[PDB]
Design a binder for this molecule. Structure first.
Ligand SMILES: *[C@@H]1O[C@H](CO[C@@H]2O[C@@H](C)[C@@H](O)[C@@H](O)[C@@H]2O)[C@@H](O[C@@H]2O[C@H](CO)[C@@H](O)[C@H](O)[C@H]2NC(C)=O)[C@H](O)[C@H]1NC(C)=O
Ligand SMILES: *[C@@H]1O[C@H](CO[C@@H]2O[C@@H](C)[C@@H](O)[C@@H](O)[C@@H]2O)[C@@H](O[C@@H]2O[C@H](CO)[C@@H](O)[C@H](O)[C@H]2NC(C)=O)[C@H](O)[C@H]1NC(C)=O
Ligand code: N0C
Ligand code: NAG
Ligand code: NAG
Ligand code: NAG
Ligand code: NAG
Ligand code: CL
Ligand code: CL
Ligand code: CL
Length: 527
């Protein structure tokens, strides 16, 4: 029986067997007052101490959210849907510590992605027991509010100030600062890591002054705040708050009385109307996300980044080879997960219309022009691969590379990777390649489980990645020093070296997607 006395009361965990050893799990510790009733849309309030032994032996509720229903019964999509009850009462976190209890363990804090509208820390691919067992780190993950319930913004107005989900995350980081030494953790050695909107969230903690003192280092997997989906502007934020209000019949003149009205609405009513607050959307639409609230985010983040106003520390940044393919089968014509999705020029052009609805004809013309000067001109998958590269280069790779250049220009060590291994267990078809989100199982060490049907080479790659991530968290340097591994060079704005991660040969390369990113970063923002 392991009971740990935290600042708000005692908690009981479970013991788990992992690779012939033991990890102690505390699943489902509250870290805030439940944001219900008059607390909905408000910042998270601090928690009132309890006098019992809180039983942290089961994952807590996931936060309210719409679910992916596009492929019922298909593991490729359903592996991401919430696996605990949805509820507004969802401000909880999880702790994995090694057995025996460590003394000053580095702490890894995971922030899941999900477009700021879905996600949950209880997912199988976010299980921290492997990292705790293998690397002797402590792994913390938390649930945070998403959708309108987490990012509705009437800026200035504390009934709905915006960014609540970011403040949930921050209040969890605070909980680690106040409580992790009781679990054997070093609060002075905390590394944030996250994927997709989770990565964008990590990057916004690097800019938020209220988070500066709550972590040491940061890891950004396939995401950053300067991506085009990651920050909502104040003008469209209030357009969307207002559009949601008319949709629920909550239109008022008292902006505060609108919130009071929306607080009497059932969570389901808010959820069904979230999709329609935008006039046109895309499979990447983020109707309710981070805004410049004047609290978490004091200025436009592009400005802060450009002017060096952020936490000086090391970062580890990376992307996957086929970030964009996942989104093509959620609306692009001619695409399907159940055939090779070979599409014509006109379908490609129709595809651009779906991914760039508000963009001018000339802007779409300019995307087609840069992505369809073919070498062979006869390969039948030319247009299928081009649309995927368009969506991936614009939405993930080029912003990640630009974040890394700008951040490292202020003197900090940065490391960039390019993940190009397709999981042997990937349920999506081969033409979708190395998909968005399918490095996560390697980071969390799932192929170390010999029973889980990964190849031997995937085990080896995962063990290397897990070691590099943990050396980054512990020592700021993502080397694997014992097995004659390729040294991971620092990424500088001059040479722009990055490391490739694959089962075959890890290689040092320079200047990822050079011609593509010049287009997205220097021409396209003008259109
Ligand atoms: C800002 O909001 C207005 C409100 O229109 C909403 O449109 C739907 C999304 C629906 O969910 C309702 O809440 C609103 O009617 C947008 O104006 C509309 O624009 C589209 C065409 O682009 C079309 O529905 C109507 O012509 C417009 N409706 C009204 C009432 O004006 C507007 O486009 C939004 N965005 C911007 C940038 O202003
Ligand atoms: C690949 O499949 C798409 C999807 O259409 C359906 O997909 C399968 C599940 C199958 O069981 C059938 O129901 C359909 O084929 C195809 O896109 C369709 O293409 C034709 C016209 O080209 C037509 O039925 C629809 O307009 C398309 N549906 C869309 C765009 O959603 C596509 O043609 C298939 N490609 C190949 C190479 O087989
Ligand atoms: C990467 N990974 C695997 C962790 C993601 C994941 O687990 N779930 N992903 C969710 C998601 C959903 C949407 C939008 N859904 N809109 C809809 O109408 C769909 N519905 C029915 C309301 C759910 N957008 C984005 C997203 C946006 C920008 C960048 C990256 C992702 N992500
Ligand atoms: C907490 O766990 C103990 C151990 O099994 C159990 O006896 C106790 O009833 C639990 N408390 C609550 C409130 O469920
Ligand atoms: C843990 O390490 C920090 C510095 O990283 C040190 O200040 C602290 O006292 C240590 N705590 C232990 C060893 O319990
Ligand atoms: C109505 O709006 C005023 C500002 O015009 C605000 O001070 C007041 O609090 C609002 N009503 C309620 C019940 O809050
Ligand atoms: C290094 O190689 C040994 C085999 O010699 C293996 O057992 C170990 O897991 C490897 N370590 C890493 C970090 O890959
Ligand atoms: Cl490539
Ligand atoms: Cl052609
Ligand atoms: Cl160009």
């Amino acid at each position: 029986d392991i009971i740990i006395a935290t600042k708000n009361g005692k908690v009981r965990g479970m013991q788990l067997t992992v690779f012939g050893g033991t990890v102690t799990a505390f699943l489902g510790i509250p870290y805030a007052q439940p944001p219900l009733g008059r607390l909905r849309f408000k910042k998270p309030q601090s928690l009132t101490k309890w006098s019992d032994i809180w039983n942290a032996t089961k994952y807590a509720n996931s936060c309210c959210q719409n679910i992916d229903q596009s492929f019922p019964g298909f593991h490729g999509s359903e592996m991401w849907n919430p696996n605990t009850d949805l509820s507004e009462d969802c401000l909880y976190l999880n702790v994995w510590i090694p057995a025996p209890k460590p003394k000053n363990a580095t702490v890894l804090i995971w922030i899941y992605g999900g477009g700021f509208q879905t996600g949950t820390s209880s997912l199988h691919v976010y299980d921290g027991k492997f990292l705790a067992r293998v690397e002797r780190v402590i792994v913390v993950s938390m649930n945070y509010r998403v959708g309108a319930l987490g990012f509705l913004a009437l800026p200035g107005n504390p009934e709905a100030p915006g960014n609540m989900g970011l403040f949930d995350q921050q209040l969890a980081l605070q909980w680690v600062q106040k409580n992790i030494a009781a679990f054997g953790g070093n609060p002075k050695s905390v590394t944030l890591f996250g994927e997709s909107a989770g990565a964008a969230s990590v990057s916004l903690h690097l800019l938020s002054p209220g988070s500066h003192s709550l972590f040491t280092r940061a890891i950004l997997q396939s995401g950053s705040f300067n991506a085009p989906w990651a920050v909502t502007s104040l003008y469209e934020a209030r357009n969307r708050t207002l559009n949601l209000a008319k949709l629920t019949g909550c239109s008022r003149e008292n902006e505060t009385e609108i919130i009071k009205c929306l607080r009497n609405k059932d969570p389901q009513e808010i959820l069904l109307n979230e999709a329609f607050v935008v006039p046109y959307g895309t499979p990447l639409s983020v109707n309710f996300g981070p805004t410049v609230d004047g609290d978490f985010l004091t200025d436009m983040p592009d400005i802060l980044l450009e002017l060096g106003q952020f936490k000086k520390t090391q970062i580890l940044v990376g992307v996957n080879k086929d970030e964009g393919t996942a989104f093509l089968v959620y609306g692009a014509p001619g695409f399907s997960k159940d055939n090779n999705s070979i599409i014509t020029r006109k379908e490609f052009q129709e595809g651009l219309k779906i991914f760039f609805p508000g963009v001018s004809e000339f802007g779409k013309e300019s995307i087609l022009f840069h992505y369809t000067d073919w070498v062979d001109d006869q390969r039948p998958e030319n247009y299928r691969e081009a649309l995927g590269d368009v969506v991936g280069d614009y939405n993930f790779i080029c912003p990640a590379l630009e974040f890394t250049k700008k951040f490292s220009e202020w003197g900090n060590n940065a490391f960039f990777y390019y993940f190009e291994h397709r999981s042997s267990k990937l349920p999506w078809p081969e033409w979708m390649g190395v998909m968005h989100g399918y490095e996560i199982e390697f980071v969390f060490g799932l192929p170390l489980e010999r029973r889980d049907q990964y190849t031997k080479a995937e085990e080896i790659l995962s063990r290397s990645i897990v070691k590099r991530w943990a050396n980054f968290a512990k020592y700021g340097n993502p080397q694997e020093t014992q097995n004659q591994s390729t040294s991971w060079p620092v990424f500088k704005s001059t040479e722009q070296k990055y490391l490739t991660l694959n089962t075959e040969s890890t290689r040092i390369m320079t200047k990822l997607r050079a011609q593509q990113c010049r287009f997205w970063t220097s021409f396209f923002p003008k259109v």
